């Protein structure tokens, strides 16, 4: 909840509530009660919706891929290296804090589309997919059927099209006491090579694939990944991203104006 | 072994956790902590509004 | 007998005096201190040089001009060459420390201008060329200040130094969220910040990671009438606070 | 007739068994026993670290 | 479960084990310790590196032979090049410290010989040439051992290294007044001394003064029958104890 207004009458003193020294770096705790007369107002407004928890706690697409039901050579499955910088929306949000800590709520929205052919007599059964997570170091799949899909240890989800979207929870899997949103450092101790957040980045890959081919007719399924931070903790606020994003592995940008211009320094007709 | 918390109004709601890993729980939104003194007034020296920042 | 301008700070064999100041900004309200047994991972006993390292090192000066866009100094490194600090820094794998930054600049009652002194933790910067990564020399030059530009930087491996974005793709005028003070020649003389150790890990290497960058950008361009002294220098003085070190071995950096 | 156990943290969770065969229950992961003395120090003779293994 | 031969010493990241020893000679019965406020003159606060400096540094080895007259190492300097010890040693005007000297040499049950390991404090040496003073390089070569001779040394500026007089004009067989242990291959394996700070002043410079010299002289010449291993090395390992430093400044030595 917000602070309510205090009743104010006229004043005559050597007290200077109106003047400070911004050079201090301290922000003024000046209310309207100073510098003007005010009535009394019991303010009930709540800041409940601007809590860090609520600002972040909302599913957001972070990526998506494709894969066919058919293809000789295996080669008809997809993968994606987990990371939250390939999407503009959420990245900018998470990047309003230097360090953060939170659990994640994974939600997948799987859909299938059928493409044009010549194939006839098609009466396709339900489609069942498989999303498999592979922690870093684990054996990665090669073809739509390499042994590794047994997931004897790697966790994964099986899902039949037509049902409620799949969903899981992930604990704070960070190595350090928190996730790092930025890293003004290098990977190797001789500053040679990778520079940027891209070095802290290392959370395994996600593998998708059709379990059953369905029919002989060509089909293309798409998997959408949705993150949703929970039980959040945030440290060190930062200036929101001004320039548009240019790369997923770094801060790179092309210089941008601070805002838009108007005619005079006096124009109320804002841009 | 459940728990009752008040709702967001201008009445409560019961709740039980069914999973073993606390990560499975829902977001805690009934939270309301706040310290602006970190970001504003981060001066080692306390400032009186009535007074000047130089004397 | 005092003025909230007056000020005397002492650490080791060094001492700072302030005839004109505001206050002293203190990190995020957090004052630096030695790592507790509860927040530690490294099991070996740490070294606490103390006086030998936690003292005032004064970097090379820089000249302020009517066109100067700004300056910056990465920090874990910048002191990589300062006495026993830089040393303990070369012989150890891990280290953590706080700091007392003191930027000093003085003009006359007839000069005018205004500087912004900030401490950006984790100031990752972009490259001038979208496809590459900025080379080390472009990022930091130890005690030698690096410079921002009043325009777009160019190709190869330099940093996109255009000031309006602080080389981080943000609005330069918002840096004020990080610890800072203003040096307004008209009323100021020096600025002093107390940055505590800030990182997502109890300790870190010091040559591989710069946990924060000091930036001195002028928002109010320096000016003066003819006849006034023309050379107005800026001098940065920093002092490590509560420096611990772990993982001793031979010295260098890969 | 339920039961409350603590969750895995850095709060509990209620639980009831609905089936008659104990085999139907979920894996007991709140378990934490451990005896390395089986595999290490399986000597009939207790060894003092400060001392030598031959004297 | 023990033997007054067994032995485990630990300081910092270093650890020493003794499968064959006598006891441990301790200075003049005095065990090293930090300078008290009552015996001090330097008013500035001292630095106590601790773990970073008070650890085991192992000098270059030397080969023992059937003719080897002996070896010696000046001490304040010898560690002038060892990690952070040597460093604190270059940045400070004053310093004081104790030591744990451990000389190690091993042969087989079929080899025979006997070494004398001593710590001569204030081991001023004479010149080979009466009229001059022995040059620095002849006095000490840091971690590189210097050698005694089985005869008279010669001219210019060398040291009168003839062993019978330990280059000090005394009877070599009397060095036993200073802290010492014997390494008698037949029953020994290592020798360990604990030299405390010994000087006529609470602290001293470390590059201008060598408060003691370690000497390893063989009284019983090494020997063995044909077929036995022929290379028998000697290795010195020393560890600073309770090192304090005062008067910090730039580094070097005039
Ligand atoms: C079937 C179930 C499948 C479950 C799959 C779970 C996959 C893991 C998803 C984790 C998402 C974490 C998002 C946190 C943001 C961090 O990426 C950032 C953001 O800039 N940088 C960083 O990379 C921070 C550096 C921290 C390093 C952590 C190492 C694990």
XYZ file of C-alpha atoms in Angstrom, chain C:
254
model
C 33.475 24.098 13.682
C 32.430 22.292 10.459
C 30.847 22.232 6.968
C 29.103 19.195 5.344
C 31.754 19.945 2.677
C 34.704 19.399 5.032
C 35.856 15.728 5.106
C 38.838 13.559 6.142
C 39.197 9.905 5.041
C 42.153 7.685 6.047
C 43.197 4.167 5.051
C 46.752 2.960 5.595
C 49.413 5.507 4.718
C 46.893 7.458 2.659
C 44.558 10.321 3.649
C 41.847 12.252 1.773
C 40.566 15.733 2.553
C 37.401 17.345 1.182
C 37.044 21.169 1.320
C 33.897 20.914 -0.875
C 31.579 17.894 -0.977
C 27.909 16.905 -0.781
C 27.865 13.738 1.373
C 29.314 10.325 0.614
C 27.255 7.919 -1.426
C 27.463 4.391 -0.022
C 26.939 1.522 -2.443
C 23.394 0.249 -2.176
C 23.349 1.281 1.421
C 25.645 -1.682 2.010
C 29.005 -0.995 3.571
C 31.859 -3.376 2.534
C 33.022 -6.158 4.876
C 34.878 -9.520 4.993
C 33.179 -12.656 3.615
C 31.404 -14.734 6.308
C 31.927 -18.488 6.860
C 28.239 -18.855 5.935
C 28.530 -17.416 2.449
C 31.838 -19.077 1.522
C 32.793 -21.979 -0.764
C 36.597 -21.794 -0.946
C 37.761 -23.906 2.014
C 41.377 -22.675 2.126
C 42.287 -19.882 4.507
C 42.188 -16.461 2.835
C 44.854 -13.719 2.989
C 43.883 -10.321 4.320
C 46.788 -7.961 3.385
C 44.994 -5.104 5.092
C 47.088 -1.925 5.246
C 49.420 -3.186 2.543
C 46.577 -3.400 0.065
C 43.548 -1.525 1.383
C 44.972 1.975 0.778
C 44.600 4.891 -1.635
C 45.982 4.375 -5.135
C 45.796 7.459 -7.410
C 45.481 6.699 -11.143
C 46.794 8.784 -14.012
C 45.034 12.120 -14.470
C 43.047 13.237 -17.497
C 42.399 16.686 -18.965
C 38.835 17.951 -19.210
C 37.984 19.990 -22.269
C 35.099 21.820 -23.840
C 34.558 18.821 -26.092
C 35.404 15.897 -23.799
C 32.543 13.357 -24.223
C 33.533 11.344 -21.182
C 35.835 8.723 -19.658
C 35.581 5.326 -18.012
C 37.806 2.837 -16.164
C 36.990 -0.852 -15.763
C 37.789 -1.779 -12.207
C 38.734 -5.178 -10.907
C 41.575 -4.373 -13.345
C 42.942 -0.812 -13.327
C 44.628 -1.520 -10.073
C 46.223 -4.563 -11.698
C 49.422 -2.521 -11.580
C 49.145 -0.886 -8.176
C 51.614 -2.031 -5.538
C 50.796 -5.049 -3.450
C 47.222 -4.939 -4.521
C 48.052 -5.782 -8.113
C 50.436 -8.397 -6.767
C 48.076 -10.337 -4.518
C 45.937 -10.008 -7.605
C 48.414 -11.875 -9.786
C 49.298 -14.662 -7.371
C 45.719 -15.615 -6.550
C 42.912 -17.360 -8.422
C 40.213 -15.778 -6.275
C 39.682 -12.389 -4.678
C 36.959 -10.049 -3.432
C 37.005 -6.448 -2.265
C 35.128 -3.218 -1.758
C 36.250 0.268 -2.730
C 36.249 3.929 -1.873
C 36.243 5.904 -5.107
C 37.149 9.568 -4.992
C 36.999 11.655 -8.164
C 38.605 15.076 -7.849
C 38.356 18.071 -10.164
C 38.639 21.768 -9.384
C 37.990 25.043 -11.203
C 37.435 28.638 -10.114
C 34.271 30.516 -9.218
C 34.333 31.698 -12.815
C 34.457 28.295 -14.454
C 31.312 26.216 -14.997
C 30.478 22.657 -15.940
C 29.042 19.463 -14.521
C 30.234 15.850 -14.339
C 28.377 12.645 -13.533
C 30.380 10.141 -11.495
C 28.938 6.623 -11.464
C 29.820 3.047 -10.660
C 28.235 0.658 -13.091
C 28.491 -2.887 -11.848
C 28.746 -5.461 -14.617
C 29.124 -2.885 -17.367
C 29.174 -5.185 -20.385
C 29.791 -3.149 -23.526
C 28.922 -3.622 -27.153
C 31.175 -3.691 -30.195
C 31.381 -0.955 -32.811
C 30.920 -3.700 -35.398
C 27.780 -5.836 -34.967
C 29.418 -9.042 -36.108
C 32.404 -9.004 -33.732
C 33.388 -8.740 -30.116
C 35.426 -5.745 -28.874
C 39.055 -6.622 -28.175
C 40.442 -6.344 -24.589
C 42.528 -3.232 -25.227
C 39.377 -1.444 -26.326
C 37.574 -2.473 -23.169
C 40.125 -1.377 -20.558
C 43.576 0.127 -20.487
C 44.356 -0.319 -16.821
C 45.065 3.006 -15.185
C 44.736 4.774 -18.527
C 41.242 6.107 -18.928
C 39.240 5.098 -21.973
C 37.123 7.591 -23.850
C 33.551 7.933 -24.970
C 32.797 9.795 -28.206
C 30.435 12.493 -29.334
C 29.426 10.294 -32.281
C 29.424 6.747 -33.614
C 32.578 4.694 -33.142
C 34.108 2.828 -36.041
C 34.674 -0.696 -37.271
C 36.881 -3.669 -36.554
C 36.979 -4.356 -32.833
C 36.456 -1.085 -31.026
C 33.710 -0.320 -28.567
C 30.596 1.562 -29.622
C 31.728 4.541 -27.558
C 29.024 7.002 -28.596
C 28.215 8.645 -25.275
C 24.450 8.841 -25.576
C 24.358 5.084 -24.950
C 27.315 4.630 -22.574
C 28.336 1.827 -24.918
C 25.711 -0.383 -23.291
C 22.710 0.347 -25.458
C 20.852 2.337 -22.812
C 19.914 5.972 -22.287
C 22.967 7.713 -20.862
C 20.685 9.935 -18.790
C 19.489 6.951 -16.765
C 22.818 5.811 -15.387
C 21.620 7.448 -12.206
C 20.247 4.145 -10.873
C 23.757 3.021 -10.069
C 25.746 4.572 -7.201
C 26.676 8.150 -8.166
C 27.395 11.771 -7.295
C 27.593 14.900 -9.405
C 30.549 17.273 -9.598
C 29.018 20.643 -10.359
C 32.000 23.005 -10.501
C 29.730 25.765 -9.242
C 29.173 24.022 -5.886
C 31.425 20.967 -5.972
C 35.040 19.956 -5.849
C 35.061 16.189 -5.444
C 32.780 13.162 -5.482
C 33.028 10.121 -3.222
C 31.446 6.703 -3.512
C 31.824 3.570 -1.393
C 31.247 0.551 -3.595
C 30.820 -2.737 -1.717
C 31.624 -6.095 -3.291
C 28.783 -6.789 -5.716
C 28.589 -10.059 -7.623
C 26.563 -13.252 -8.051
C 29.376 -15.217 -6.392
C 31.263 -14.891 -3.074
C 34.560 -14.413 -4.926
C 35.905 -14.196 -8.433
C 39.052 -14.071 -10.504
C 40.328 -10.559 -10.996
C 41.842 -10.629 -14.475
C 38.984 -12.450 -16.135
C 36.153 -10.354 -14.706
C 35.540 -6.624 -14.200
C 32.767 -6.408 -11.621
C 32.128 -2.719 -12.335
C 33.114 0.317 -14.319
C 33.597 3.902 -13.218
C 32.312 6.472 -15.692
C 32.828 10.212 -15.657
C 30.621 11.898 -18.218
C 30.078 15.631 -18.513
C 26.411 16.637 -19.008
C 27.166 20.341 -18.571
C 30.122 21.141 -20.892
C 33.076 22.957 -19.343
C 33.358 26.652 -20.184
C 35.122 29.808 -19.095
C 35.851 33.276 -20.411
C 39.132 34.209 -22.073
C 41.924 34.691 -19.594
C 40.699 32.012 -17.245
C 43.018 29.075 -16.616
C 42.511 26.731 -19.545
C 43.753 23.383 -18.183
C 41.277 21.652 -15.932
C 42.338 18.155 -14.904
C 40.318 15.334 -13.356
C 41.972 12.819 -11.038
C 40.671 9.470 -9.852
C 41.801 8.004 -6.542
C 40.586 4.591 -5.405
C 41.132 2.476 -2.311
C 40.479 -1.284 -1.952
C 38.497 -2.186 1.153
C 38.473 -5.574 2.903
C 40.368 -7.419 0.217
C 40.539 -11.211 0.670
C 42.353 -13.619 -1.586
C 42.195 -17.364 -2.110
C 43.841 -20.078 -4.156
C 47.510 -19.132 -4.067
C 49.909 -20.307 -6.791
C 52.484 -19.014 -9.283
C 51.708 -15.651 -10.837
C 50.421 -14.355 -14.175
C 47.138 -14.882 -16.124
C 46.904 -18.046 -18.338
